[PDB]
Amino acid sequence: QVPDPNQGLRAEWMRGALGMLWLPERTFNGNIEGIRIDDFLTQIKDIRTVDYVQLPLTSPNIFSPTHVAPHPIIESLWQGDTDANGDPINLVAPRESVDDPLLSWLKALRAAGLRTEIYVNSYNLLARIPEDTQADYPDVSARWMEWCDTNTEAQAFINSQTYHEGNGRRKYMFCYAEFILKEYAQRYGDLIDAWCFDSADNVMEDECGDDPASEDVNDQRIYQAFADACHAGNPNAAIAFNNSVGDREGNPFTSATLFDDYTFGHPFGGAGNMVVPEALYTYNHDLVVFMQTNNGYAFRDDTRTWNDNVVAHFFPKQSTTSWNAGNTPCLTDEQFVEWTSTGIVNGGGITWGTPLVRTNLENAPVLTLQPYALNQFELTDTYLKEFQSPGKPNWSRQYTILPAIYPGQPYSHNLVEGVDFWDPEGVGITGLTASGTLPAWLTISQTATGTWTLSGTPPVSEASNYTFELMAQDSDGVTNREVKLEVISHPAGFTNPGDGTPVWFSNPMVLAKATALKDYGSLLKLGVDFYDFEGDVLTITKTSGPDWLVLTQNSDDTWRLSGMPTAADAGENSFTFNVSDGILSSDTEIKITVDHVAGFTNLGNGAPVWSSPILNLTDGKGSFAYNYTLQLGTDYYDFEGDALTITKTSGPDWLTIQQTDANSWKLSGTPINSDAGENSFTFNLSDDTNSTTAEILINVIATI
Ligand SMILES: [Ca+2]
Ligand SMILES: [Ca+2]
Ligand SMILES: [Ca+2]
Ligand SMILES: [Ca+2]
Ligand SMILES: [Ca+2]
Ligand code: NA
């Protein structure tokens, strides 16, 4: 039904809206499994005026194939390929049987009272640079295309319409919208408020022949495919496509397609600092002023009527370096507050590119804000609390979420002045009360100065939901907020013991097998592995078993087992795990089989082995210092995990060995040209009793 009469209107909440960005990097090959936004949300507890957070579905640029949510089709593209370390390769989603990180983040954001915006790079599973190869998913792009032009459903689709085919990789783009993108949208439903599609003109216009400038639906079919795929899941989801920055001499936003509910609103300037050089400061600040002048509407300035509700929105960076990370702010505290307030107070919306400390999941990630970003956001919060909507009380964020109804169980939730609601002028909240249809069992009382409590006990027979208004009062009047109550729904696979005891899924519990000298990874998750029928907060403890297994909490509903076993841990390992609610608890037995490192031959008598009789090493160069590290698990192995010693037994004098650490020995020395050619050495590997020797062979190239 294009042109769509809901276009833009469905992003009305975006007007005055303040957003943040949470973007981990290098998400592929299981990396994203078990990752949680909870620490971030803890850190920003005191930020009451923020409205939403942007999350990846895909990563940008050459990482556009890597997804953070599981999909059957994408998982198939894996084909189980592995690395020289056994680690996955060509896996560009989380394994469906392991984790859905996105659903985690989506629900945590909901519970935290926040809406969501989802980032998708338009190039998706295709390769942005086809004459490049990605050494982590080397042929996923190939396989996606492969899957596309040979599939019962996925040709009946490619051929289902005439406009599906055309220039470049157009047909594959429609694949993604229908089979990948639509499945996600349908799954998540109203947990997703907005989608922003990056690199849209790069691929949809320049490659696949769409015209974003046009108002002919036939020119914007890919734009349609993507929007419709999103609207199938949430008809109120606001859509934005990155069709480049606008004009410094005019509208700073590239004109709306028929499928834009809001402006993507990329800043002027390339990579790096969006306010240096200085001209960019003017261009970008004028963009924010544009949002103010136009009361948050992007396109009330042209000759088309249909785009008149499209919301003005900006996607700036807070750091000097990137959207999602960066050590240094590009704006002063004062400038940050001014830009934000100029842009959104009776204006449009802003997704700040808020920097986390360390986003690379392969390098000890710290997925919380840079202290300065919190600083700036807090100063902003103080301002918006006082000045965004003066007079009557303000409620926090976008929603007020109440705990679930548990039939027969006591109900209790606090609403706190300064947290959930406040008087802008700071005199105080003089009352809280309700109107509408409330549980007969519910009392609303003031339990301390500034704290109201919703409490009571639903009967066992309570099975109804509730929708009513809470009303906060100050000297100036009342402001309403719609709140919901919903009856809990227990997961299947669990038997209520009737006494409040938290329970494990089964006993024993066999987890995926570990490998010696390899970091272990397994998850324990509320509602899957353990559960509590009163929804009490739970603690898990390892109570017995070998030392190597490490337990850490990722969130209130997610724990992680890690650690590196040794060859000594080989075979069936057994562990006790307690789950407690603080009052009652229960145990289970966890079983993990530790396998030996592959590629070595057990001799059966306790002797260490070596990877080979001849370890052919890296060339040396005459007069250049030589270095090479021998590694337990790569070069040499002991099936009992005994401490090993390597001593030299023969060969040229220039090369010696010294223990680096428990697991590695360094061969070093400086060869000269007189040492040119194949230098043969012998080394002995002894443990306590049994010893085996190997040959090390280094070719020394003379410096001519
Ligand atoms: Ca707000
Ligand atoms: Ca217009
Ligand atoms: Ca007031
Ligand atoms: Ca309990
Ligand atoms: Ca041994
Ligand atoms: Na799961």
Side-chain angles (χ1 to χ4, degrees), residues 3-130 132-151 154-182 184-206 208-333 335-485 487-512 514-571 573-590 592-608 610-620 622-690 692-703:
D4 190 329
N6 293 314
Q7 189 188 9
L9 267 171
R10 62 177 158 268
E12 162 65 23
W13 60 265
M14 180 111 38
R15 282 173 75 253
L18 173 62
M20 311 182 79
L21 176 66
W22 193 85
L23 179 58
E25 291 180 28
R26 311 190 69 77
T27 64
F28 43 70
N29 294 331
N31 290 339
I32 193 65
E33 281 155 350
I35 293 304
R36 298 294 186 255
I37 198 170
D38 296 73
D39 286 348
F40 169 79
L41 291 184
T42 290
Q43 191 192 32
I44 65 154
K45 263 174 82 77
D46 200 28
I47 309 175
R48 303 278 87 208
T49 60
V50 58
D51 298 296
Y52 70 99
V53 176
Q54 179 180 130
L55 301 166
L57 166 53
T58 94
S59 300
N61 212 40
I62 63 175
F63 305 93
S64 65
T66 70
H67 290 60
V68 301
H71 203 275
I73 311 178
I74 301 173
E75 196 168 355
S76 87
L77 266 76
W78 175 28
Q79 286 169 7
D81 316 319
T82 57
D83 162 38
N85 277 132
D87 293 302
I89 228 153
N90 280 298
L91 179 64
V92 285
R95 297 166 271 229
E96 225 285 333
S97 62
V98 180
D99 196 35
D100 186 358
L102 186 56
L103 179 58
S104 184
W105 315 334
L106 286 173
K107 284 171 88 163
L109 281 170
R110 171 61 60 87
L114 293 166
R115 284 163 105 112
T116 76
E117 180 186 33
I118 301 291
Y119 174 98
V120 170
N121 187 280
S122 289
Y123 274 94
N124 67 81
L125 291 161
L126 284 328
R128 196 194 170 95
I129 319 294
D132 277 32
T133 298
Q134 309 310 323
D136 286 278
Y137 38 99
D139 32 66
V140 153
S141 283
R143 291 183 199 170
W144 162 243
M145 281 156 147
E146 215 81 74
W147 179 91
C148 293
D149 38 63
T150 50
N151 187 273
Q155 223 94 46
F157 184 75
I158 296 195
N159 296 135
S160 61
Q161 279 278 14
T162 67
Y163 55 62
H164 275 30
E165 213 143 348
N167 330 58
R169 297 168 290 204
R170 177 179 182 95
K171 65 183 176 186
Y172 308 125
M173 290 286 301
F174 276 98
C175 271
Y176 188 87
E178 179 74 26
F179 288 125
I180 311 293
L181 180 61
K182 184 161 98 156
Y184 284 132
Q186 281 183 309
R187 204 190 287 168
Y188 301 125
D190 72 4
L191 288 176
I192 294 179
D193 301 79
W195 298 82
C196 61
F197 295 98
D198 201 5
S199 295
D201 61 355
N202 300 69
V203 61
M204 283 147 88
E205 172 179 17
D206 286 10
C208 305
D210 272 35
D211 184 15
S214 165
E215 80 191 305
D216 194 347
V217 64
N218 293 278
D219 297 328
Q220 309 180 353
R221 283 294 181 191
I222 312 179
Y223 291 96
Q224 190 175 31
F226 278 56
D228 283 326
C230 295
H231 286 124
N234 184 9
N236 293 319
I239 318 303
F241 297 88
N242 185 4
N243 295 314
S244 295
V245 68
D247 173 20
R248 80 190 181 276
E249 305 294 6
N251 196 317
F253 310 114
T254 291
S255 202
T257 66
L258 289 158
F259 304 104
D260 281 291
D261 295 285
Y262 67 114
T263 62
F264 192 96
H266 192 277
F268 292 89
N273 192 332
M274 80 164 177
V275 299
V276 178
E278 219 160 34
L280 298 180
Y281 188 103
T282 294
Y283 302 156
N284 286 312
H285 189 262
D286 288 347
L287 183 157
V288 126
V289 171
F290 187 88
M291 285 170 63
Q292 175 182 254
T293 304
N294 282 284
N295 307 304
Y297 296 104
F299 303 114
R300 253 119 108 144
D301 65 343
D302 64 3
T303 55
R304 305 166 164 188
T305 58
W306 51 265
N307 65 14
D308 275 10
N309 297 126
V310 174
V311 168
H313 158 275
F314 187 29
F315 195 6
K317 322 173 206 197
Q318 183 171 14
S319 90
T320 59
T321 55
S322 66
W323 272 274
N324 69 325
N327 213 46
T328 309
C330 68
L331 294 183
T332 63
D333 297 353
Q335 282 164 351
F336 191 86
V337 175
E338 181 276 312
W339 282 48
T340 301
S341 53
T342 291
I344 74 173
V345 179
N346 305 303
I350 299 173
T351 309
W352 275 103
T354 54
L356 305 175
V357 163
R358 198 188 301 116
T359 55
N360 180 353
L361 293 172
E362 299 172 334
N363 191 23
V366 183
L367 300 179
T368 56
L369 292 175
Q370 284 285 0
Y372 76 77
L374 181 62
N375 171 70
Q376 300 198 315
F377 250 82
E378 285 287 5
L379 293 170
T380 301
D381 199 56
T382 298
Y383 183 94
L384 296 175
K385 282 177 82 200
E386 186 174 349
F387 296 113
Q388 181 164 18
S389 319
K392 286 172 181 44
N394 302 163
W395 286 84
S396 65
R397 309 190 166 177
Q398 285 291 298
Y399 310 119
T400 297
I401 304 296
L402 301 180
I405 297 162
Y406 284 76
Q409 294 304 305
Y411 192 90
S412 205
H413 183 82
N414 292 347
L415 292 186
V416 179
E417 189 187 5
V419 178
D420 297 288
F421 42 64
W422 61 87
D423 154 17
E425 285 74 29
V427 183
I429 296 289
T430 53
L432 172 78
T433 184
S435 60
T437 301
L438 276 76
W441 51 261
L442 191 75
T443 301
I444 294 181
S445 54
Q446 163 138 235
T447 53
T449 168
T451 301
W452 283 260
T453 307
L454 273 58
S455 71
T457 301
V460 184
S461 48
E462 171 76 85
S464 73
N465 297 347
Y466 291 84
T467 304
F468 54 101
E469 302 285 288
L470 287 185
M471 300 172 300
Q473 186 186 44
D474 62 9
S475 66
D476 196 73
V478 88
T479 304
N480 291 21
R481 166 81 58 109
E482 179 190 288
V483 295
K484 288 168 84 78
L485 280 173
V487 172
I488 184 70
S489 183
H490 305 287
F494 288 100
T495 295
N496 190 349
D499 69 351
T501 310
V503 286
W504 294 94
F505 171 78
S506 71
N507 186 9
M509 273 195 201
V510 182
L511 300 182
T515 306
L517 307 184
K518 188 179 182 295
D519 291 288
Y520 182 73
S522 199
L523 297 171
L524 300 175
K525 298 197 284 161
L526 185 72
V528 186
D529 306 295
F530 62 93
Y531 185 73
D532 185 287
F533 278 88
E534 301 75 44
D536 299 325
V537 52
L538 302 181
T539 309
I540 300 172
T541 314
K542 168 179 173 190
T543 62
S544 72
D547 299 291
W548 72 262
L549 189 67
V550 170
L551 169 77
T552 51
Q553 185 171 18
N554 283 357
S555 69
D556 270 5
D557 70 4
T558 305
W559 299 66
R560 163 92 189 268
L561 296 173
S562 60
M564 187 184 273
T566 72
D569 297 298
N573 290 234
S574 208
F575 307 90
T576 301
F577 279 83
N578 183 83
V579 60
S580 162
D581 68 14
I583 300 164
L584 304 168
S585 65
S586 68
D587 302 318
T588 196
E589 171 189 8
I590 303 277
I592 306 169
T593 302
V594 172
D595 281 351
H596 280 304
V597 173
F600 297 101
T601 309
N602 183 242
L603 290 172
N605 57 96
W610 292 95
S611 64
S612 185
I614 306 177
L615 270 73
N616 196 6
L617 255 47
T618 310
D619 290 358
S623 81
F624 290 98
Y626 185 87
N627 285 286
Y628 198 105
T629 291
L630 295 179
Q631 193 89 49
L632 176 70
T634 313
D635 303 294
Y636 64 84
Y637 195 57
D638 176 67
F639 285 91
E640 301 78 22
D642 304 317
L644 290 335
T645 307
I646 306 184
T647 59
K648 190 193 189 179
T649 58
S650 79
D653 274 348
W654 65 265
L655 178 93
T656 62
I657 203 184
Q658 202 169 46
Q659 198 167 19
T660 301
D661 62 24
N663 295 289
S664 58
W665 294 69
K666 183 173 79 187
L667 294 161
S668 52
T670 309
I672 58 170
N673 289 23
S674 77
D675 298 320
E678 301 291 348
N679 286 232
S680 179
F681 303 83
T682 72
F683 287 89
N684 178 96
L685 179 65
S686 81
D687 82 20
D688 260 337
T689 77
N690 266 122
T692 175
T693 76
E695 175 186 345
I696 282 73
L697 174 77
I698 298 161
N699 188 4
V700 174
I701 309 289
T703 314

